[model samples]
Target chain A: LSAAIHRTQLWFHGRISREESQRLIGQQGLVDGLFLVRESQRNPQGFVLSLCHLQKVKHYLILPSEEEGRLYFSMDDGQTRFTDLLQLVEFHQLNRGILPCLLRHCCTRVAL
Target chain B: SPASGTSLSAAIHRTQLWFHGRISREESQRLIGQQGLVDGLFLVRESQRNPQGFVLSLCHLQKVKHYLILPSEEEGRLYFSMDDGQTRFTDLLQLVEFHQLNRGILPCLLRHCCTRVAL
Candidate 1:
């Protein structure tokens, strides 16, 4: 049940390609913080956070580390580790950190 | 407490192309008009009057109509309704998904939205 809840968050779309990801953000007014995360085809073991700036879309790859059989997520090579992908997002929403801007409007409304 | 479900119910809606959060009524109407206002062409937006409420704007027969959605709380759990609790839905997505299949009270079934570039 918990897993299902997390899986349904609007911030994450399942397996859209990089081109589709860009088009999704493009159609949504191009406002800042319009974003979505998807399973990375480029990195089968990783994910991508596609964020929209006021005018453009920027993608950040989230790499993973196997630690004690747990998948550790990081954007900058473990400089800051997150136990869950949700943590990485929640943290970035509050702080720009390595990103250019904080996540504002979560881009939802992308077609399946 | 349950986890920060910032919206398990609403999250389903955000993934749909029909939801345009906080767009003004005029903007919604203009969007429909610009898109040719085909019958059943619709979009949902956050209600300006009621922050907790939502509005479903649809185009039919060269006319645009708006319906306000209010929340009904039978218990601690909340539900969305279009007709004074007549048609209740667990989430906006469920409401939209059903309306597409069953018109119920809406004049025409929702067919599609503005041109989308995504899959």
Candidate 2:
């Protein structure tokens, strides 16, 4: 519990304008925080879909819990498990960025 | 004011309920009161981004007997009552926990009262 109690940072390549960011906030969709990609402690990495978009790169998620975690995307699917996001959190992001994020990961055994 | 307008204060710090979609936007305005209604904002996750939930006054908590919770995509919603407008953050947190655990229950507890309403 102590190890995972720290902050978890995430990185994203998708570019959203300031208005979009605020609108997403206004729309009650995303929150304001530092987004990041960690170079340390990583496993799964994606292929850069397009250098312009950078979807093929790999990033890190600062683990909030030591034990493995899970997430729910609302819609049901087997491919997107909580562990996938947990793996993302394994790496630590150095500097956080300004971007809206979805908390798609969770500490499976913990309650709200 | 209309019935919905009268209940506008009820939205503060209360759980996200099914009726939210049915209710008009004016009725959803955030109200600042002496009770702990405003405290819910502080409890929000910094990373969670926006104010999807709110704090309730105790009086409202008592009048609004119950809230339904069910499972679904995105996070589940909450349902409860607001009478005199005196709710607290503590109560709201309980409901949040309930939704996280019961997010996938069939015939969810939110069936009637706690429908999954979008923010």
Candidate 3:
């Protein structure tokens, strides 16, 4: 766990911080149980999708290009790919591969 | 208020059966009260992106989440996920069913009570 955090900081520095990550976890709106998708700091054109369980963060990168629109990703960092981000998330939601956690809800910016 | 013989009633009943005596009507109401989920609560309707799609909008305390209903190509099957478009569900009914059992980030005891009429 500690090593993952260190690696995340090394690769994701300036894009995400420990304090901001914690705040996002506590932020309003989770669709099934816990999930979030936002623009990646690593690349503005790209995005980062995340899920949290018991204070642990599991991050996935969704890189985009004009040709493909957006690409799906798994935890292994380019080890596997999908046609779209939805497909990547759906795969994890149905099966407990690397994620192993059941999705509960999705967060949105809607106001009521 | 649910009308008989409607899809709305059917969805609610499915959820009720899924929980089956674990979450009573009174208990659900109490949980909502305890969590102060009454004010500003909203429900999702059909999706603009998909013809057979539906969305479930819920707010826990202040943050709001939206769950999407995805139709399975197999027919008669449905699935759900948060807006991330990654989560999968067997049906919209199952989405609420899971929430009833696990509070997770949702309001305590929050049930799927919305129907098309409300939409």
Candidate 4:
């Protein structure tokens, strides 16, 4: 648990683009629940959630918010609160929350 | 309207070890074969064949078996079903969690996971 946050997770790939993320998930498996996280090219310091469904992929721009001198993340303006991306991923895996599917598999890459 | 609903949310992580992403059927077999088919070792992957479906690759009697996990639509809502909609789950993880406790339609109870190493 401590390792997942303090260190880099295989599921956490850097700033891979939408096309590349979709390409990767497609190559890995076009299953309905496969997904990945990438640095958002749309905004500085923001992130992207790349998910697969019905043989197509969708992107959700995860925005960063600050309060009480700390950081939190959200997709729908705090409908669900997460201190980090991993928590968001885990919670979504168990509860679809607002996503189309329960995140089943990670779009993992071994490349640095 | 959280045009975001058309979009998405993540955490610590309820990590699932059973899912191995896009590993091919052969690749799944390779994994279970090496780990020893202890009769319930399994992994789930995107079904290249099912279009909108997924597959559960489980090991039994030293042999690998593939199960088609399809999605069901209830009016406007969708869920997962391995028993032709007889049994439904909000998410694949939930479906897998249930089968792990109740065999349902599976060959045997899921006891082991073909865990993907954190790379």
Among all candidates shown, the one with the greatest TM-score: 4
Candidate 4 per-residue C-alpha lDDT over A63-94 given as tens digits, one digit per residue, 9 for 90 to 100? 88887878899998977779998878777766
Task: List the candidates ranked by DockQ, beginning with the highest.
Answer: 1, 4, 3, 2
- Tell me the tens digit of each residue's lDDT in model 3 across A93-112: 54656564754334332222
Off by over 4 Å in 4: A1-7, B1-119
Inter-residue clash pairs, candidate 1: A108-B14, A109-B14, A109-B15, A109-B16
Q: Estimate each model's TM-score.
A: 0.48, 0.21, 0.37, 0.51
Give the local distance difference test score of model 1: 0.73
Off by over 4 Å in 3: A1-21, A27-33, A64-79, A110-112, B1-119
Q: Write the per-residue lDDT of candidate 2 for residues A83-109, one digit (tens) a residue.
A: 443232221111122212322111121
Could you give candidate 1's per-residue lDDT for residues B10-108 as a string of tens digits? 445335556777888899999878655556667888876654799999888878899888888887999998888888999887787677658787888
Report fnat, model 1. 0.00
Question: How well does candidate 3 score on lDDT at residue A45?
Answer: 65
DockQ values per model:
0.03, 0.01, 0.02, 0.03
| Ranking of predictions according to lDDT | 1, 4, 3, 2
Comparing 3 and 4 on lDDT, the stronger one? 4
Error of 1 at A80 (Å): 2.6
- Fnat per candidate: 0.00, 0.00, 0.00, 0.00
TM-score of chain B of 1: 0.76
Worst 10 residues of 4 chain A by lDDT: A1-10
